[PDB]
Design a protein around this ligand. Structure first.
Ligand SMILES: *[C@@H]1O[C@H](CO)[C@@H](O[C@@H]2O[C@H](CO)[C@@H](O[C@@H]3O[C@H](CO)[C@@H](O)[C@H](O[C@H]4O[C@H](CO)[C@@H](O)[C@H](O)[C@@H]4O)[C@@H]3O)[C@H](O)[C@H]2NC(C)=O)[C@H](O)[C@H]1NC(C)=O
Ligand SMILES: *[C@@H]1O[C@H](CO)[C@@H](O)[C@H](O)[C@H]1NC(C)=O
Lengths: 49, 48
């Protein structure tokens, strides 16, 4: 083996060309930014999710 | 699930018909005008 893939066509695993290590790849970070407000008239301080 | 399986298959379905991976078309083809080809690629993926 050299490197594996998932159900999709993205590289799941990888093997070290120097030390032959079982490695696997995860995506870095992403997602949505969600803003919670109590309304501008009531207050003006927000919170995120 | 069958819809989302179909959505995954859209990425493998190359649309602009000369590339497979965006990394490849950066390497195999030149920067300054082969970027026309990925716009063809992204817009089918957009409609998909
Ligand atoms: C590619 O080259 C790298 C080196 O640049 C090489 O990685 C080396 O792998 C070996 C074994 O996998 C490691 O060696 C061990 O090192 C520790 C501490 O340094 C020693 O104590 C170990 O000794 C044990 O094993 C020896 C061999 O059987 C015995 O003689 C001894 O008595 C002990 O039982 C062992 O030597 C080394 O740390 C790495 N080095 C690096 C920099 O990673 C790799 O194996 C090479 N790969 C290929 C495919 O050629
Ligand atoms: C804003 O909040 C106050 C609460 O004291 C309320 O009286 C006022 O009607 C609100 N503004 C609007 C446009 O509804």
């Amino acid at each position: 083996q050299q490197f594996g893939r998932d159900v999709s066509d993205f590289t799941d695993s990888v093997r070290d060309p120097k030390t032959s290590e079982i490695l696997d790849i995860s995506p870095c970070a992403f997602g949505g930014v969600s803003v919670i407000t109590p309304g501008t008239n009531a207050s003006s301080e927000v919170a995120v999710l | 699930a069958q819809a989302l399986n179909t959505l995954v298959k859209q990425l493998s379905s190359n649309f602009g018909a000369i590339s497979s991976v965006l990394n490849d078309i950066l390497s195999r083809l030149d920067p300054p005008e082969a970027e026309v080809q990925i716009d063809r690629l992204i817009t089918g993926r957009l409609q998909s």
